[PDB]
């Protein structure tokens, strides 16, 4: 299993940013957190096998339906904290 932390900016916030994100976490059954941060960046926290956290980030790249995405960053981590499910957030 692979941690990730996605840090993402664009029209991403006021869209339900957050609320697709968990489901697109939920339906891959990530663990973590997602938050969408005063300075204007979406901030998202992601535990699970590389495949499906992968792909979330893809999905991340895209995006709420009605998002525009101009610009996303990674880092990874090779262990894990351990979440025990995929949180909306607001600390």
Same mark, same amino acid.
Request: overall charge positive.
């Given at each position: 299993?692979? @941690?990730?932390? *996605? *840090?993402? #900016?664009?029209?991403? @916030? ?23 941060? #005063? #300075?204007?960046?979406?901030? *998202? ?21 009605? $998002?525009?995405?101009? #610009?996303? $960053? ?13 949180? *909306?957030?607001?600390?």
């Amino acid at each position: 299993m692979l @941690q990730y932390r *996605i *840090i993402v #900016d664009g029209r991403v @916030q006021g869209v339900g940013f957050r609320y697709f994100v968990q489901m697109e976490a939920d339906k891959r059954k990530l663990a973590g957190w997602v938050k969408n941060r #005063d #300075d204007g960046r979406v901030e *998202i926290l992601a535990e699970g096998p590389e495949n499906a956290l992968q792909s979330f980030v893809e999905a991340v790249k895209n995006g709420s339906p009605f $998002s525009k995405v101009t #610009d996303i $960053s990674v880092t990874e981590s090779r262990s894990l904290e351990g979440h025990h499910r995929f949180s *909306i957030v607001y600390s």
